[PDB]
Amino acid sequence: RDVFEVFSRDGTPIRGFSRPGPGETVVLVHGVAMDRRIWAESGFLDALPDAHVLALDLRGRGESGRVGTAEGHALRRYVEDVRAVLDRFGRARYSLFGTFFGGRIALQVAAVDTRVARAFSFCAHAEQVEIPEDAVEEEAVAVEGPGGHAYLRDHFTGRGAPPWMVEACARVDPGELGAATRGLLHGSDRRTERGHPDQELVLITADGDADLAPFHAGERRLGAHLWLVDAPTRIKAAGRLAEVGRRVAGVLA
Ligand code: NA
Structure with a gap:
């Protein structure tokens, strides 16, 4: 692997790695309480034999780069972070894959950037949601204080998340956990749109998901395909991420 740096629109430096390969170029977008290490730890990276x-x-x-503000964590800023990565590697076609909120980010990038040929959203849908302000603030206070890492570790352990998802939380600065949570009030409630007719859009979730309806809504409204994994909840579906990677590799081939 090589390391790279690019700059987002607002000046924030965005760091990552490039794993060279002769196949399709794939851009991976992690969830809120995560970082780029989850791709290898989950087995997703190993499931893509040929991709760059x-x-x-x-x-x-x-x-x-650090942010530390609610508005700095608006969805539109994350979209700008991903688009900067697309610039550095200079391709006309990319395939994006995102986990949880990273899936929502990937779908919004697809809506606005004509270089996105495929976008896959793992355990996040594309529909408008209602985001209650009091619930958001309650969660932000819970995650940002001295007890915030223990709060998240206990939450994810009790919900059966994979060990890598439990452990990633303690690698995120408490203040950024709080700010990212508040950032949800700056645009993440709106639905995402299809960017262009030829794009391939894929939603993935647990067959046992308690709220499949918004996933079916994206099939209809966006022409997205819906993939299911054997799991009773979205958090437990994260145990199937390498399996999903194998099916992504089949599309790229
Ligand atoms: Na990522």
Whole structure:
């Protein structure tokens, strides 16, 4: 692997790695309480034999620049972070894959950037949601204080998340956990759109998901394909991420 740096629109440095390969160029976008290490730890990276893989740390996570503000974590800023990565590698076609909120980011990049030929969203849908302000603030306070890492570790352990997803939380600065949570009030509630007719859009979730309806809504509205994995909840579906990677490799082949 090689390391790279690019700059987002607002000046924030975005750091990542490039894993060279002769196949399709794939850009991987992690979730909120995660960083770029989850791709190897989950087995997703190993499931792509040929792809040229670009994996970024989103702002405020991993080796990327600090933010520390709610508006700095708006969805539109994360989209700008990903588009900067597309610029550096100079291709006309990319395939994006995102986990949880990273899937929502990938779908929004697809809506606005004509270089995105494929976008896959793992355990996140594309529909408008209602985001209650009081619930957001309650979660931000929970995750940003001295007890915030223990709060998240206990939450994810009790919900059966894979060990890599439990452990990633303690690698995120408490202040960025709080700010990213508040950033949800700056545009993430709106639905995402199809960027162009030839794009391939894929949603993935647990067959047991308690709220499959918004996934079916994206099939209809966006012409997206829906993939299911054997799991009773979205958090437990993360145990199937390498399996999903094998099916992604089949599309890229
Ligand atoms: Na990533």
